[PDB]
Symmetry: C2
Subunit: 241 residues, 2 copies
């Protein structure tokens, strides 16, 4: 059977190692290029990854993310789903939303989900408190498989109220229950779940607890070890249940 | 002093009657072209306005809304704000978001606000329950005036939890408190508030209760009369307070 694994590898190199039409569900949150959007100007609370400075020319960052999304479109099975978590950023005192580059991809946007994180450290009073991230639910372009009946009532809507995972030592993770919602509704046991920016391995832990197959890529061997330790101490608990 | 009024007039004709740089705050929700997006195919729960069928060729609808937004950019004062309420629609089983046309306007998007309506009559289980509308906060292009300190804690964030106004006889209105948040934070007493799709006059009632000047346009004399009756029975109550 397929060997589930977290591979230390560049995300595009990993995606290009997968055949067409081979992944049922992708759940992922890329680096957000906050430092790079600022042209390298430091800021308080700056996200610094183990082996990545998050400081790419913004136009090049957008082209890179488009290549990622286009590879995801290739590797998705017909009827599969890709959940891409991003957030509105700020550029020159104006909104800088992900939609400005997402719309050019081969993937077809099925629905935008709102992740309500409840609170944010950013209390700048020049705008409303920005505690929302977006989860773009894409499907392949050539309705997706979706079983909303599997969810509790409080996750059947387009706003998901999930607090950030403050106990996770990774600098910018998402909670396990977020990945669980995506996986449970769009896959069957044994189906392949992929996270090409696996980080602390949240998507893979969720897939494992739900008895789905899993594959993750990240460039940090420290984060791979973080996943392995987390998997070992996971009692296969599903946080939804 | 300026004569506050609800005028029965086409929205573009009304906007083009205003000089440049003359309006501090716009709050508006246009017809959403749900029937027109469907190419005129009827649907249950169809919105039918008094004098408007909501059935425009979708490309022409988008060009029209762009003309509206471009006129708003012209008539806004520097530092003013326009709050444009729209919603993701569905086309051919895929997402059809307003951003696909909003991005071409002369207005500069400052922030997207999420209006959480709590529930929706649309219980189609092929997607998550779509009870969110968006409020696009734009400013003029050549930070906007904004006093978040005037709001209660529960409206300082990017999600506003406001139930729909089910007692309003207009077929598709928004609640008074929505307009109050926008007006209170971006204007001073006496400043001009405009709604070019005034409907039941919600924006104008809110402006009047806050002692702002107001101007509204709509094509229905029935809705103008609806506003006049509503204003007369309004005890100048501010729902926020
Ligand atoms: N070229 C790249 N290929 C693969 N991973 C990368 C690359 N550049 C950055 N990363 C990783 O992208 C990840 C982004 C994280 N925010 C993801 C965290 C993850 N959602 C979690 O729950 O832990 C980081 O762990 C980076 O190490
Ligand atoms: N060309 C037009 N010019 C002005 N108003 C129009 C035009 N076409 C449609 N309308 C109006 O657009 C309005 C859209 C409404 N959904 C607005 C309701 C409003 N937000 C309220 O709270 O009552 C309707 O009242 C229509 O009569």
């Amino acid at each position: 059977s397929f060997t589930n694994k977290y591979v230390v590898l560049d995300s595009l190199e990993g995606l290009r190692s997968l055949p067409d039409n081979s992944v049922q569900c992708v759940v992922t949150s890329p680096p957000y290029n906050k430092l790079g959007l600022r042209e390298g100007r430091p800021y308080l609370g700056q996200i610094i990854y183990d082996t990545y400075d998050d400081n790419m020319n913004e136009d090049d960052y957008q082209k890179w993310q488009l290549q990622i999304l286009n590879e995801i479109n290739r590797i998705l099975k017909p009827g599969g789903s890709a959940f891409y978590n991003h957030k509105d950023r700020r550029f020159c005192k104006r909104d800088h939303p992900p939609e400005k580059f997402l719309s050019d991809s081969d993937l077809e946007l099925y629905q935008t989900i709102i992740w309500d994180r409840g609170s944010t450290v950013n209390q700048n009073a020049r705008y409303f408190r920005p505690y929302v991230e977006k989860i773009f639910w894409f499907t392949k372009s050539i309705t997706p498989k979706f079983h909303r009946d599997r969810l509790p009532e409080y996750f059947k809507g387009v706003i998901w109220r999930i607090p950030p995972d403050k106990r996770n030592k990774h600098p910018a993770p998402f909670p396990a229950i977020l990945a669980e919602i995506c996986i449970l509704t769009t896959t069957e046991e044994g189906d392949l779940v992929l996270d090409p920016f696996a980080g602390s391995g949240t998507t893979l832990v969720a897939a494992a607890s739900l008895k789905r197959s899993y594959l993750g890529f990240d460039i940090s061997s420290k984060y791979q070890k973080m996943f392995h330790q987390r998997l070992a101490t996971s009692k296969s608990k599903v946080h939804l249940w």
